Amino acid sequence: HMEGLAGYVYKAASEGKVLTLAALLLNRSESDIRYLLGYVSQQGGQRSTPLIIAARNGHAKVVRLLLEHYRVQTQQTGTVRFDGYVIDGATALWCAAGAGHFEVVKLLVSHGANVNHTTVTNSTPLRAACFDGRLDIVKYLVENNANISIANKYDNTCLMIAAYKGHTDVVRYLLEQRADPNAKAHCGATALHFAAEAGHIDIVKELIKWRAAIVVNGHGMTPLKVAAESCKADVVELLLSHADCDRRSRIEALELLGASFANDRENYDIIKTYHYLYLAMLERFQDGILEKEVLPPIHAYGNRTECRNPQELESIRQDRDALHMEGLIVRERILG
Amino acid sequence: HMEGLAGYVYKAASEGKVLTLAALLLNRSESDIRYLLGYVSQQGGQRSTPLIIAARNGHAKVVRLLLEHYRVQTQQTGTVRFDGYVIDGATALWCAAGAGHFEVVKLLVSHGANVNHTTVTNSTPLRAACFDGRLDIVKYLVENNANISIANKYDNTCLMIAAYKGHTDVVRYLLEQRADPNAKAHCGATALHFAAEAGHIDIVKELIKWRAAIVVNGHGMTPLKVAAESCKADVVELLLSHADRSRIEALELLGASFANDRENYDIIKTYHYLYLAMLERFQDGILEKEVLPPIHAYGNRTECRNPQELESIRQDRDALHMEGLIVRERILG
Ligand SMILES: O=C(Nc1ccc(F)cc1)c1cccs1
Ligand SMILES: O=C(Nc1ccc(F)cc1)c1cccs1
């Protein structure tokens, strides 16, 4: 059928050949043009229309022709491919936003594109831009009345995803536009919880400057202890210079922070494994005191047992091997 | 007393001023030279002798003078500092081996240094040299009757530390010199367990030419599952070219490790080892798969029980990440 002629209009659109597109559409009845420009084309794992592919591929030159003259409906959705993950429900705007195609975004929403249509995971074009941290498209959409509040399937908001990937400038912009830094995901994670795991220290300070609230990971820990278990030490101390827990919860972070300098081989430093573990014990006998029930030796980590006295952990300051597994068991008593 | 001139000969020894050291000792009775050369000097928490520092600092010219003329006893031990750890029981030879001082090692053993003296932790000079991976001193000491077998307090053999720090050349020399590849530490960990943890693929094949590894690296693991949790995929697949349930646990834990592992995190590779893992645990009783109830943590998603379930989730980054955390907690805890 004219299914072959659709392949040609898709090919010209995907590769940005304005000259080819116009010559292909020039002498066509309106019935046929709506078929040609609305044809869902199977190319790889992408179900697309000429406009969606033209936008995903950043051929603004081609996108202009279709929206101005041939007046193509901007609400068309398809299933497109971004890197290695297939996304279904993607509109020309969402493809143009995720792929960071500056001009194409500005052209579609200027010609009336619904900036708040969502994929099946309910990622807005703004979220795509927040994931990749393209500041110009994040600024553009919000001042074009995009909804910073609409979040993904798992309540993971643009502010949360901007923090995990660490787009400091984008994160502060949304905070200024008064995005809620206390939203919670299906995980329970706050935007802070996320920035803590990835140690985006400047983002952590930005969120606090914008009256962010400390709340337990609804399904686990505090943002402090996710910093500790993630071993991001500078972050761990930042948060320990804001309202903490006297000795109690505060020392629990230090214990786990020093325990995380031990257990992961990537950033393993037994010197700071001891450094934090010892200072935790210091903050446990100050004035008054507060001890630890330790677990049996557990035939596994040899027969090492967790230290109960400062002098005890002092002894091991010469032994790498023992301090390393002292950390492995420190960690295992809080997590397990 | 003569404590002031003793301080001076230590200074000359540590800084390698052979001529200066010699100028201090020449018109001294043999009684006095033993005080000067036997003084244990405290710098920090360090107990040192002029000979030990000359060896720790690799000043061969000074070490020759001391052993040759003034005939200083090679026995003599002290407490020295290295990578940041104060080590007790260190002899001039052991210091020179950790510090990779080629000649000073060659000079000390020639005048009778016990190549098998052990620190307080029972570290051979061979172990020290194996940690630093200096192959020339590893061969030299071995060809002068060093015992590849004498291990640290925790049964950690020279082969283990050569694997952990990843000195392929030291590992292959030790294996060719016929080191035991099946020793176990107090953890239970074999040399492979260590090579897997750090993913030293070339060494892992080297041990394969010989070995055969049991269980536990500290938590009841085979070297395969230590590779999986460490996310070392290439190692996991190398080791997956041998003999067997155990197969599915490795793939599951490796793919579950690509999620939580922010260091080498790839959500695509989570959905790959987890998908290929789905062969035969779930819907029988194939074999038995007890899934955990959807606990408030990884949201309330529940672990996939059928191949078809994991196919739907082939897309969605958010969803596959919590699928890894769920598998991880089921195999671990
Ligand atoms: O926006 C997202 N993912 C994305 C798309 C395109 C791209 F280039 C980079 C990232 C999403 C996050 C959660 C659901 S969708
Ligand atoms: O590994 C050891 N010592 C060492 C390591 C690296 C180095 F550069 C210098 C010395 C050990 C000392 C006691 C037991 S093991």
Tab-separated table of C-alpha atoms in Angstrom, chain A:
chain	number	residue	atom	x	y	z
A	1	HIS	CA	0.000	0.000	0.000
A	2	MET	CA	1.084	3.553	0.741
A	3	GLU	CA	2.847	1.844	3.624
A	4	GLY	CA	5.934	2.162	1.419
A	5	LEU	CA	5.450	5.894	0.957
A	6	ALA	CA	5.272	6.210	4.748
A	7	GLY	CA	8.725	4.638	4.998
A	8	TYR	CA	10.049	7.463	2.835
A	9	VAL	CA	8.448	10.216	4.921
A	10	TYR	CA	9.827	8.593	8.085
A	11	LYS	CA	13.292	8.278	6.527
A	12	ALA	CA	13.360	11.948	5.508
A	13	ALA	CA	12.107	13.026	8.941
A	14	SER	CA	14.470	10.878	11.021
A	15	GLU	CA	17.516	12.085	9.069
A	16	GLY	CA	16.372	15.714	8.966
A	17	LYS	CA	16.049	16.129	5.186
A	18	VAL	CA	13.620	19.065	5.050
A	19	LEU	CA	14.188	19.226	1.294
A	20	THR	CA	13.120	15.583	0.936
A	21	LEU	CA	10.136	15.894	3.291
A	22	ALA	CA	8.568	18.829	1.435
A	23	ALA	CA	9.008	17.158	-1.962
A	24	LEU	CA	7.392	13.989	-0.582
A	25	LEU	CA	4.361	15.735	0.913
A	26	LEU	CA	3.909	18.365	-1.762
A	27	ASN	CA	1.222	17.039	-3.916
A	28	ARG	CA	-0.831	15.044	-1.463
A	29	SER	CA	-4.487	14.976	-0.546
A	30	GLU	CA	-5.268	15.793	3.067
A	31	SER	CA	-6.545	12.256	3.566
A	32	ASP	CA	-3.191	10.839	2.483
A	33	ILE	CA	-1.080	13.385	4.409
A	34	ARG	CA	-2.824	12.473	7.660
A	35	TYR	CA	-1.920	8.846	6.957
A	36	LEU	CA	1.659	9.669	5.910
A	37	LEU	CA	2.388	11.881	8.928
A	38	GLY	CA	0.469	9.675	11.381
A	39	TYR	CA	1.982	6.356	10.338
A	40	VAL	CA	3.395	4.345	13.250
A	41	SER	CA	6.737	3.129	11.885
A	42	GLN	CA	8.690	0.120	13.173
A	43	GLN	CA	12.421	0.950	13.023
A	44	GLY	CA	14.393	-1.022	15.591
A	45	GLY	CA	12.516	-1.053	18.863
A	46	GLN	CA	10.866	2.299	18.201
A	47	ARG	CA	7.200	2.807	17.285
A	48	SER	CA	7.269	6.389	16.034
A	49	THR	CA	5.736	9.063	13.829
A	50	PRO	CA	7.750	11.437	11.596
A	51	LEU	CA	7.325	14.196	14.197
A	52	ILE	CA	8.380	12.075	17.188
A	53	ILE	CA	11.514	10.801	15.450
A	54	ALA	CA	12.266	14.279	14.064
A	55	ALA	CA	12.080	15.631	17.621
A	56	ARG	CA	14.006	12.758	19.221
A	57	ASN	CA	16.756	13.331	16.640
A	58	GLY	CA	16.846	17.107	17.140
A	59	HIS	CA	16.086	18.084	13.549
A	60	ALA	CA	14.400	21.351	14.459
A	61	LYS	CA	14.501	22.287	10.772
A	62	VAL	CA	12.164	19.352	10.049
A	63	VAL	CA	9.962	19.876	13.125
A	64	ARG	CA	9.234	23.452	12.017
A	65	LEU	CA	7.799	22.365	8.644
A	66	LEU	CA	5.338	19.899	10.182
A	67	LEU	CA	3.999	22.135	12.954
A	68	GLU	CA	3.759	25.335	10.888
A	69	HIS	CA	2.491	24.274	7.453
A	70	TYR	CA	1.204	20.703	7.688
A	71	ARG	CA	-0.186	21.370	11.216
A	72	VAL	CA	0.603	18.007	12.811
A	73	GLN	CA	-1.042	17.144	16.127
A	74	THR	CA	1.590	17.558	18.856
A	75	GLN	CA	-0.127	15.048	21.181
A	76	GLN	CA	1.215	12.019	19.283
A	77	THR	CA	2.871	9.426	21.511
A	78	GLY	CA	5.076	6.496	20.572
A	79	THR	CA	7.579	4.055	22.018
A	80	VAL	CA	11.149	5.279	21.490
A	81	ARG	CA	14.626	4.147	22.511
A	82	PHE	CA	16.937	6.204	24.739
A	83	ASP	CA	20.379	4.647	25.210
A	84	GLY	CA	19.489	1.118	26.279
A	85	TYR	CA	16.025	1.401	27.851
A	86	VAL	CA	12.800	1.369	25.833
A	87	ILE	CA	10.313	4.062	26.889
A	88	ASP	CA	6.662	3.756	25.868
A	89	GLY	CA	4.270	6.682	25.841
A	90	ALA	CA	6.931	9.156	24.721
A	91	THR	CA	5.652	12.292	23.018
A	92	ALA	CA	7.670	14.409	20.586
A	93	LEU	CA	8.243	16.855	23.448
A	94	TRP	CA	9.471	14.159	25.845
A	95	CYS	CA	11.891	12.801	23.244
A	96	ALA	CA	13.036	16.354	22.504
A	97	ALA	CA	13.539	16.990	26.241
A	98	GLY	CA	15.345	13.791	27.209
A	99	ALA	CA	17.670	14.084	24.218
A	100	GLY	CA	18.495	17.678	25.213
A	101	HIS	CA	17.336	19.163	21.895
A	102	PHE	CA	17.095	22.809	23.016
A	103	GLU	CA	15.473	24.257	19.902
A	104	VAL	CA	12.974	21.443	19.325
A	105	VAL	CA	11.536	21.813	22.830
A	106	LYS	CA	11.152	25.570	22.423
A	107	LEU	CA	9.449	25.072	19.048
A	108	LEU	CA	6.890	22.473	20.164
A	109	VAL	CA	5.635	24.104	23.369
A	110	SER	CA	5.621	27.473	21.604
A	111	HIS	CA	3.307	25.832	19.051
A	112	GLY	CA	1.048	24.569	21.843
A	113	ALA	CA	2.600	21.322	23.123
A	114	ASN	CA	1.171	19.978	26.400
A	115	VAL	CA	4.324	20.161	28.568
A	116	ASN	CA	2.737	17.911	31.195
A	117	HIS	CA	1.895	14.740	29.280
A	118	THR	CA	3.549	11.691	30.786
A	119	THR	CA	5.129	8.414	29.738
A	120	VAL	CA	3.728	5.178	31.173
A	121	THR	CA	6.069	5.604	34.148
A	122	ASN	CA	4.670	9.164	34.331
A	123	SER	CA	7.961	10.942	33.666
A	124	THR	CA	7.228	14.433	32.476
A	125	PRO	CA	9.306	16.193	29.826
A	126	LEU	CA	10.549	18.227	32.801
A	127	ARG	CA	11.653	15.037	34.584
A	128	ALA	CA	13.597	13.862	31.522
A	129	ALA	CA	15.371	17.232	31.540
A	130	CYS	CA	15.971	16.910	35.298
A	131	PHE	CA	17.370	13.382	34.885
A	132	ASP	CA	19.931	14.577	32.315
A	133	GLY	CA	20.347	17.909	34.129
A	134	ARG	CA	19.910	20.143	31.079
A	135	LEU	CA	19.426	23.461	32.870
A	136	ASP	CA	18.061	25.410	29.891
A	137	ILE	CA	15.183	22.995	29.278
A	138	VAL	CA	14.469	22.744	33.018
A	139	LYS	CA	14.228	26.541	33.207
A	140	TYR	CA	12.250	26.739	29.969
A	141	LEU	CA	9.498	24.263	30.866
A	142	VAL	CA	8.756	25.619	34.362
A	143	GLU	CA	8.445	29.205	33.116
A	144	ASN	CA	6.227	27.720	30.398
A	145	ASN	CA	3.966	26.464	33.188
A	146	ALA	CA	5.287	22.922	33.533
A	147	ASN	CA	4.287	21.187	36.735
A	148	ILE	CA	7.333	20.548	38.929
A	149	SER	CA	5.067	18.561	41.289
A	150	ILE	CA	3.927	15.720	39.010
A	151	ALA	CA	6.110	12.716	39.875
A	152	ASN	CA	6.843	9.283	38.425
A	153	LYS	CA	4.976	6.033	39.186
A	154	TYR	CA	7.008	5.630	42.391
A	155	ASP	CA	6.419	9.230	43.585
A	156	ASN	CA	10.069	9.935	42.653
A	157	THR	CA	9.989	13.643	41.760
A	158	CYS	CA	12.205	15.745	39.490
A	159	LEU	CA	13.913	17.189	42.578
A	160	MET	CA	14.762	13.708	43.868
A	161	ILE	CA	16.119	12.467	40.535
A	162	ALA	CA	18.084	15.698	40.053
A	163	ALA	CA	19.769	15.075	43.417
A	164	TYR	CA	20.728	11.434	42.802
A	165	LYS	CA	22.393	12.315	39.490
A	166	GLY	CA	23.851	15.389	41.221
A	167	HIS	CA	22.765	18.332	39.028
A	168	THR	CA	23.513	20.945	41.694
A	169	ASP	CA	22.421	23.951	39.620
A	170	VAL	CA	19.175	22.293	38.490
A	171	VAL	CA	18.493	21.195	42.079
A	172	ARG	CA	18.779	24.719	43.470
A	173	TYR	CA	16.612	26.128	40.667
A	174	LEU	CA	13.685	23.858	41.564
A	175	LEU	CA	14.174	24.654	45.248
A	176	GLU	CA	13.933	28.368	44.404
A	177	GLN	CA	10.761	27.736	42.363
A	178	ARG	CA	9.525	26.310	45.688
A	179	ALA	CA	9.549	22.594	44.997
A	180	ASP	CA	8.821	20.532	48.068
A	181	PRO	CA	12.085	19.067	49.423
A	182	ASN	CA	10.085	16.774	51.733
A	183	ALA	CA	8.280	14.630	49.155
A	184	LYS	CA	8.622	10.888	49.738
A	185	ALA	CA	8.970	8.065	47.216
A	186	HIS	CA	7.410	4.615	47.268
A	187	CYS	CA	10.786	3.724	48.791
A	188	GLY	CA	10.302	6.353	51.491
A	189	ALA	CA	13.349	8.250	50.241
A	190	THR	CA	13.510	12.025	50.493
A	191	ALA	CA	15.488	14.141	48.035
A	192	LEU	CA	18.034	14.429	50.850
A	193	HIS	CA	18.177	10.629	51.298
A	194	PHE	CA	19.154	10.434	47.625
A	195	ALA	CA	21.804	13.173	47.687
A	196	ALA	CA	23.252	11.541	50.806
A	197	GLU	CA	23.849	8.142	49.178
A	198	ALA	CA	25.632	9.817	46.245
A	199	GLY	CA	27.487	12.303	48.457
A	200	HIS	CA	26.411	15.405	46.528
A	201	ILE	CA	27.527	17.597	49.413
A	202	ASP	CA	26.670	20.930	47.768
A	203	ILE	CA	23.173	19.657	46.987
A	204	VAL	CA	22.847	18.486	50.604
A	205	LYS	CA	23.667	22.005	51.802
A	206	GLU	CA	21.304	23.529	49.232
A	207	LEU	CA	18.391	21.382	50.416
A	208	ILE	CA	19.080	22.353	54.037
A	209	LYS	CA	19.272	26.063	53.159
A	210	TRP	CA	15.746	25.588	51.769
A	211	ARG	CA	14.286	24.436	55.077
A	212	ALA	CA	14.392	20.733	54.294
A	213	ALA	CA	13.193	18.450	57.045
A	214	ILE	CA	14.987	15.475	58.528
A	215	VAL	CA	12.675	12.474	58.425
A	216	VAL	CA	13.458	8.800	58.764
A	217	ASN	CA	13.613	6.961	55.474
A	218	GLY	CA	10.023	5.811	55.955
A	219	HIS	CA	11.317	2.352	55.147
A	220	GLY	CA	14.677	2.337	56.971
A	221	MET	CA	17.205	4.939	58.155
A	222	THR	CA	17.934	8.658	58.440
A	223	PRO	CA	19.657	10.633	55.648
A	224	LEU	CA	22.649	10.723	57.992
A	225	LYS	CA	22.935	6.930	58.190
A	226	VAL	CA	22.452	6.499	54.444
A	227	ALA	CA	25.442	8.842	54.169
A	228	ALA	CA	27.320	6.682	56.693
A	229	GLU	CA	26.529	3.329	55.072
A	230	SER	CA	27.273	4.887	51.688
A	231	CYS	CA	30.611	5.895	53.343
A	232	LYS	CA	30.333	9.541	52.166
A	233	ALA	CA	32.206	10.968	55.143
A	234	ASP	CA	32.227	14.701	54.365
A	235	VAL	CA	28.445	14.429	53.950
A	236	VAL	CA	28.226	12.486	57.240
A	237	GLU	CA	29.815	15.378	59.151
A	238	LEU	CA	27.868	18.125	57.386
A	239	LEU	CA	24.647	16.557	58.673
A	240	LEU	CA	26.276	16.084	62.088
A	241	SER	CA	26.509	19.883	62.398
A	242	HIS	CA	22.714	20.185	62.490
A	243	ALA	CA	20.275	18.975	65.143
A	244	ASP	CA	21.464	15.455	66.061
A	245	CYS	CA	21.000	13.100	69.044
A	246	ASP	CA	23.357	14.101	71.879
A	247	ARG	CA	25.397	10.892	71.934
A	248	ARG	CA	22.854	8.196	70.928
A	249	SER	CA	21.907	8.313	67.227
A	250	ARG	CA	24.924	10.551	66.549
A	251	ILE	CA	27.484	7.904	67.541
A	252	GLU	CA	25.511	5.280	65.614
A	253	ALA	CA	26.372	7.150	62.417
A	254	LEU	CA	30.074	7.324	63.299
A	255	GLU	CA	30.078	3.604	64.135
A	256	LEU	CA	28.529	2.720	60.766
A	257	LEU	CA	30.618	5.299	58.875
A	258	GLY	CA	33.800	3.766	60.242
A	259	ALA	CA	32.291	0.350	59.557
A	260	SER	CA	31.740	1.358	55.914
A	261	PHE	CA	35.334	2.500	55.484
A	262	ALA	CA	36.083	-1.189	56.119
A	263	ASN	CA	33.559	-3.361	54.316
A	264	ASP	CA	33.605	-2.007	50.730
A	265	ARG	CA	36.927	-2.673	48.963
A	266	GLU	CA	36.487	0.332	46.646
A	267	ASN	CA	37.175	3.086	49.188
A	268	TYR	CA	38.595	0.912	51.956
A	269	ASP	CA	40.655	2.861	54.494
A	270	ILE	CA	41.340	0.996	57.732
A	271	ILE	CA	42.898	4.154	59.207
A	272	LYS	CA	39.558	5.971	59.015
A	273	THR	CA	37.789	2.732	59.959
A	274	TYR	CA	39.595	3.062	63.289
A	275	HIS	CA	39.484	6.876	63.368
A	276	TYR	CA	35.666	7.000	63.347
A	277	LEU	CA	35.186	3.848	65.441
A	278	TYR	CA	37.478	5.207	68.166
A	279	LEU	CA	35.871	8.653	68.264
A	280	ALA	CA	32.504	6.929	68.590
A	281	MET	CA	33.762	5.248	71.772
A	282	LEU	CA	35.110	8.558	73.038
A	283	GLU	CA	31.563	9.908	72.684
A	284	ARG	CA	30.386	6.975	74.808
A	285	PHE	CA	32.321	7.401	78.061
A	286	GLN	CA	32.581	11.254	78.227
A	287	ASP	CA	30.759	12.100	81.451
A	288	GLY	CA	28.214	10.174	83.476
A	289	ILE	CA	28.104	6.219	79.970
A	290	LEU	CA	26.639	4.018	77.216
A	291	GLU	CA	28.006	0.596	76.257
A	292	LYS	CA	27.326	-1.937	73.437
A	293	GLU	CA	25.909	-5.406	73.490
A	294	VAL	CA	28.181	-7.209	71.209
A	295	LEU	CA	27.329	-10.454	69.434
A	296	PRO	CA	29.149	-13.778	69.873
A	297	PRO	CA	32.430	-14.143	67.950
A	298	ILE	CA	30.535	-15.944	65.134
A	299	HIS	CA	32.817	-18.640	63.724
A	300	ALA	CA	33.389	-16.831	60.422
A	301	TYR	CA	35.253	-13.600	61.134
A	302	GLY	CA	37.744	-15.774	62.973
A	303	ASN	CA	36.798	-15.345	66.621
A	304	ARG	CA	37.134	-11.550	66.727
A	305	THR	CA	34.558	-9.829	68.927
A	306	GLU	CA	33.529	-6.177	68.929
A	307	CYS	CA	35.411	-3.959	71.346
A	308	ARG	CA	33.578	-2.696	74.427
A	309	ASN	CA	36.321	-0.464	75.927
A	310	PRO	CA	38.368	2.337	74.304
A	311	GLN	CA	41.601	0.664	75.417
A	312	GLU	CA	40.351	-2.457	73.632
A	313	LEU	CA	39.994	-0.727	70.252
A	314	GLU	CA	43.270	1.084	70.991
A	315	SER	CA	45.088	-2.268	71.016
A	316	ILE	CA	44.035	-2.913	67.413
A	317	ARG	CA	45.334	0.415	66.055
A	318	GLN	CA	48.421	-1.519	64.882
A	319	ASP	CA	46.566	-4.409	63.180
A	320	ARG	CA	45.110	-3.824	59.714
A	321	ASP	CA	43.638	-7.339	59.494
A	322	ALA	CA	41.889	-7.117	62.856
A	323	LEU	CA	40.650	-3.552	62.332
A	324	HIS	CA	39.233	-4.575	58.936
A	325	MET	CA	37.171	-7.418	60.303
A	326	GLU	CA	36.338	-5.425	63.386
A	327	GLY	CA	34.621	-3.180	60.876
A	328	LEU	CA	32.900	-6.079	59.091
A	329	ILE	CA	31.385	-7.141	62.433
A	330	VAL	CA	30.665	-3.549	63.522
A	331	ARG	CA	28.620	-3.191	60.335
A	332	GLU	CA	26.877	-6.560	60.676
A	333	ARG	CA	25.453	-5.823	64.132
A	334	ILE	CA	23.660	-2.671	62.999
A	335	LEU	CA	22.682	-4.114	59.570
A	336	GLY	CA	21.611	-7.728	60.002
